[PDB]
């Protein structure tokens, strides 16, 4: 089908990437730098760490957000249904939460085998919550050399948009209900093979095994979480 579970796609990814730019993002696939060796804290200082000056007073907000890098858990990702295949560089991982791969498909749904080279190739991914089908949201790397993200709408002298978690800042808002991207909590990621290439500033995160229940089904998953500076168990 359009999606593929079990951590095995075949080749039908979009092999369209760029080489003019000298940034060498593709060349940065063999190795990753240290936390402080790549100037992360400049790019990590633009979002509020723990408690975002809010209390509260269930609804969904469309709004918008299209500009800033999705490198920390604050975001308002938009809804994406179809994307041209000329822009995609690498697998497009979508989160059930369990990672799943979507491959290039023709307009009418016919699978195509061209490594994404042919012009007409597109990707159909109608972001939708698993309770109604499909995946919460998902991520890939654009051809020009920058990460992208997309997903469902955030739910409900300061402001707070919650794309995930916000347990204490909402009447028990959970991932199964409001989760959009791979951010299970403010400091946890849904680990997948290419995680270190789309989020290279989470290299220092430690590994973890987790169990989750969404709707009426159960998912066994491996997550990545750093040393949270308050507590391990809640």
């Amino acid at each position, epitope marked *: 089908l359009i999606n593929t579970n079990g951590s095995w796609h075949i080749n039908r990814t979009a*092999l369209n990437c760029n080489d003019s730019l000298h940034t060498g993002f593709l*060349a940065a*696939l*063999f*190795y990753t*730098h240290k936390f402080n*060796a790549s100037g992360c804290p400049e790019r990590m200082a633009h979002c509020r760490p723990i408690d975002e000056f809010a209390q509260g007073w269930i609804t969904y907000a469309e709004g918008h957000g299209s500009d800033q890098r999705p490198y920390c858990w604050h975001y308002a990702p938009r809804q994406c249904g179809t994307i041209p295949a000329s822009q995609v560089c690498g697998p497009v991982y979508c989160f059930t939460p369990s990672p799943v791969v979507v491959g290039t498909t023709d307009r009418f749904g016919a699978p195509t085998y061209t490594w994404g080279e042919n012009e007409t190739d597109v990707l159909i991914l109608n972001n939708t919550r698993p309770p109604q089908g499909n995946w919460f949201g998902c991520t890939w790397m654009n051809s020009t050399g920058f990460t992208k993200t997309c997903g469902g709408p955030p739910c409900n002298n300061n402001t707070l948009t919650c794309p995930t978690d916000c347990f204490r800042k909402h009447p028990e808002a959970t991932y199964t209900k409001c989760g959009s991207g791979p951010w299970l909590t403010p400091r946890c990621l849904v680990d997948y*093979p290419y995680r270190l290439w789309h989020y290279p500033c989470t290299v220092n995160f430690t590994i973890f095994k987790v169990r989750m229940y969404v709707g009426g089904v159960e998912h066994r998953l491996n997550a990545a979480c750093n040393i949270g500076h308050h507590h391990h168990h809640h």
Partner: antibody
Amino acid sequence: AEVKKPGSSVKVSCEASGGTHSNYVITWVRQAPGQGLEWMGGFIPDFRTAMYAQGFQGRVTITADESTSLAYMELTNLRSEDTAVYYCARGPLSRGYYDYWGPGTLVTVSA
Amino acid sequence: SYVLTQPPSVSVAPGQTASITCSGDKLGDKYVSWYQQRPGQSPVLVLYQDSKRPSGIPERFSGSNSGNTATLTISGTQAMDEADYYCQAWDSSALVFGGGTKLTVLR
């Protein structure tokens, strides 16, 4: 072993993905007798793009076949300096440490 | 050009602690790796990412990296720890192997 004539070409082969997820990166390291290790290049089954070292920019060519699930480097115009043992390593995808160094292949040329 | 330097040889007596140094420019900002190679055998990983050791390596091995030096430390050295040790790092989209250091134990 059998000595390769100077100016000829040799091939070094390795196992590779058959057209599915790999989750590893391949690399080639040459060791002259008692002279240490030298890198040549790396290859990613998922992205066919290779990566060659500077010193050997003009003589190495890395290519892979998916039907045979085998990726090899061709080295051309061997000289007296290119007698050595070749190791083929397979490391994790994005951690940059090579593990499971495979059996070495010796290549000799006669001045 | 990027080049890493190590001492040529180190000699220790059994039961003592041996230290091997891999040096470079601002090496502390890199993820160094260590390989152990016996004569005529393919090298095997002994330390990756400074202090993270894989499974199957005895607890005697240890490592650290700071400033301009990465130190591989062995405790309780014995006759099965004589070998060549190599230091690996990444720079400028190129791999760099440090000069091998031969560890020999005086019987």
